Amino acid sequence: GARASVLSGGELDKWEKIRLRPGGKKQYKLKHIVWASRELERFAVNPGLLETSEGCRQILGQLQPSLQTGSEELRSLYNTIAVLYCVHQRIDVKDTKEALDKIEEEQNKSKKKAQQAAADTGNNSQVSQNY
């Protein structure tokens, strides 16, 4: 039937491998997948999107621009949603940080054009610095 759950057997394997930080000592666990699923529904976003390569991309599109003015909860979300998203796409990052650079490049590639991503937005930022 249709696809269920967030991370399948294979995804779960790599998921447990990925670490929250590039130089930390706390690998990823289901605790983080559920922690976000409960926080997502709070933002009018169903947890069913976490199990969709498309949903994850959308969820990140709302937190991306809200990273600077986003509370600790927002930051944590963009992190988990990142490591997970990379799994539903193809990217096999080792840490959450890497997942940010991978997704940042994909979106940055569009910046060069700024033809479709420069109509709905009101005031874009011309000062992008690395974390």
Judged by CB under 6 A, the stretch of 5-13, 16-24, 85-93, 121-129 that binds ligand PIO is: 16-24
State yes or no: residue 37 binds ligand PIO (CB under 6 A): no
CA separation for the pair 74, 36 (Å, rounded): 10
Of 90, 92, 70, 79, which Cα lies nearest the Cα of 15? 92
Q: 33 Cβ partners below 8 Å, 6+ apart?
A: 6, 7, 15, 50, 80, 84
Over the window 92 to 131, marking each residue x when it contacts ligand PIO by CB under 6 A and - when it does not, the resulting string is ----x-----------------------------------
Q: Which is nearer to ligand PIO, 59 or 80 (CB)?
A: 80
Residue 21 contacts ligand PIO per CB under 6 A:
yes
Q: Provide the Cα torsion 35, 84, 100, 70; round to 10°.
A: -30
From 4, 42, 71, 72, residue interacting with ligand PIO (rule: CB under 6 A): 72
Q: With breaks defined as C to next N over 2.5 Å, after which residues does the chain break?
A: none
Among residues 6, 32, 49, 85, the one that binds ligand PIO under rule CB under 6 A: 32
Report the candidate in 3, 1, 4, 24 with the shortest Cα–Cα distance to residue 83: 24
In single-letter form, the type of residue at position 73 comes to E
Which CB atom, from 38 or from 113, has the smaller least distance to ligand PIO? 38
Using CB under 6 A as the criterion, which residues of the chain lie in contact with ligand PIO when the complex forms?
Answer: 20-21, 24, 26, 31-32, 35, 72, 75-76, 79-80, 96
